[PDB]
Amino acid sequence: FEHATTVPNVPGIPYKALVERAGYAPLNLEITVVSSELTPSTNKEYVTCKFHTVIPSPQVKCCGSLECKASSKADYTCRVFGGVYPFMWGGAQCFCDSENTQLSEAYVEFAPDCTIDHAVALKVHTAALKVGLRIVYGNTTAHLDTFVNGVTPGSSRDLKVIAGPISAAFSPFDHKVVIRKGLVYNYDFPEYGAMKPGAFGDIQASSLYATDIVARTDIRLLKPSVKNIHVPYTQAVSGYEMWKNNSGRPLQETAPFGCKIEVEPLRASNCAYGHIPISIDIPDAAFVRSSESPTILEVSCTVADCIYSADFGGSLTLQYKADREGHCPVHSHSTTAVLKEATTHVTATGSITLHFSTSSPQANFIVSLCGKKTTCNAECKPPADHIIGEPHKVDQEFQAAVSKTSWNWLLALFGGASSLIVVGLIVLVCSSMLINTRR
Amino acid sequence: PTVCRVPLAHTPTVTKWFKGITLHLTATRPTLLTTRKLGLRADATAEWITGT
């Protein structure tokens, strides 16, 4: 049998529904989102970290001249200097006086500690939602993971639950995402090849162990001044370090909907947003004939004292008369009241306590003890506690949220105005007919 | 990679009022307080707190 619900996507809150087939005893349905994963499709561009400025030993063909060449090393900078006469510990390093040429080389590497302290630049496409469900039908519990797309039939044994499309398309990640030691940032990194000196991504490589590193770190080779051999150079600050100082707070702390940002793989777990249209094809054997379940002769609902809060702030006793003992499913036929119980034991004459939760200031709902709908009426006072540590089990509607005293006053005012204008219209027509008969 | 020992701050005292909380925070060294809302708007406060 096919049942189409709409489960609120809040992890942990059970969603209760009653499936009634003609000729078959009502079955209790219980859908819980144990966990959720928002996994985007990732694409790694490059890996960046602090650069190691490698200055080789200066070359002095120092009676003659040297030529600058081209190398594939990262940010390979070269410069030829006119007349040097370099010194070391030992005096003059060659013979001709001002015919001495020094070649300064400076490229960029990956720091030795980069295998631990590095960032990964990623582009993430549309995200996919996957949920863990705890469908409880009858007295059988089934755990199962389904894709939230509307077509994939994730099934544990014989449940065949199809998770409909999520009502709201939400993704806490931007197009470009930076991952550094497990912390996820939304950064607009430069593309592969567009290295900006002094900014994030000034040194790029496909991997840490790659030999095709590309860099642009603004290395300016300066003319030596001192007599001792020297490679004077100046450089821009590490873009990785500058970004680390100005990174802001991660997505783990700036995420919406209480999302838990996790890595390996990148995902946003336990996000509370939207509604999921679940469709369950319950196996036939779970249902039982209407003859097998006990039949309620008459029942009546009295509600002890209720508040409308997140937790189960309500109590309810109903006196029933059953002709046979057995188990009967209990359900609240209302969107603003949810029962804590699902099945209960009925024994001839008895009374049972059912705890519920409400968002309206009225227990104005219906309860079914394996059929035999009965109505409750009471006053739900506001809770004394201001802050609780548990999510609200029921959403806040309008006709429910407005109480009956306020409804009575509103209808008194509006109906007074409407009756006033109706009396005005009737005296209008009566006076008009009197005038028409006058002349 | 190894495991370090990091301090646990003094547990805050929470005074509750209508639609809000007050945190009485005791910190002898700079301690980071981070808040965010669990809805569509995630107004996120980050502050380094020292003193009471």
- Tokens in use for B45? 């406060």
Interface membership of A254 toward B (CB under 8 Å): yes
Rounded to whole angstroms, how far apart are CA atoms A30 and A328?
15
Of all residues in chain A, the one with the smallest CA distance to B14 is A387
Could you give the count of Cα atoms lying within 13 Å of A118 in the half-sphere of its Cβ? 22
A135: tokens are 């469908």
A 191-250: CB under 8 A from B:
249
Resolution (A): 3.0
Give bridge partners of residue A132 from the DSSP assignment.
A35, A145
Identify any residues that bridge with A220 across adjacent strands, giving them in sequence order. Answer: A234
Peptide bond just before A256 cis, omega within 30 deg:
no
Determine which of B23, B34, B38 to mutate to test the interface with A (most A C-beta atoms within 10 Å): B38
CB A428 within 8 A of CB A434: no
What φ, ψ does residue B8 adopt, rounded to 5°? -105, 125
Contact A256 B21 (CB under 8 A): no
In sequence order, the β-bridge partners of residue A368 are A331, A373
E-strand spans in A49-188? Answer: 51-54, 59-61, 74-81, 87-88, 91-92, 101-110, 119-133, 136-137, 140-141, 144-148, 161-163, 176-180, 183-185
Q: With an 8 Å Cβ cutoff, are B36 and A387 in contact?
A: no
Q: Is B36 left (phi over 0), alpha (psi -120 to 50) or beta?
A: beta
Q: Which residues of B touch A116 (CB under 8 A)?
A: 1
- What are the residues facing A328 on neighbouring strands? A344
Q: Does A171 touch chain B (CB under 8 A)?
A: no
What does DSSP say about strands A326-332 and A366-369: parallel, antiparallel, or unpaired? antiparallel
Helix, coil or strand: residue A175 = coil
- A253 and B19: CB-CB below 8 Å? no
| Matching residue, tokens 């490589």 | A205
The DSSP bridge pattern shows strands A51-54 and A33-48 to be unpaired
Instruction: Give chain B's end-to-end CA distance (angstroms, integer).
Output: 35
CA distances from A197 to A75, A200, A213, A215, A219 (A): 11, 8, 15, 9, 9
Residue type, A52: H
* Residue A137 burial (CB count, 10 A): 20
- What residues of A are in contact with residue B16 (Cβ under 8 Å)? 385-387
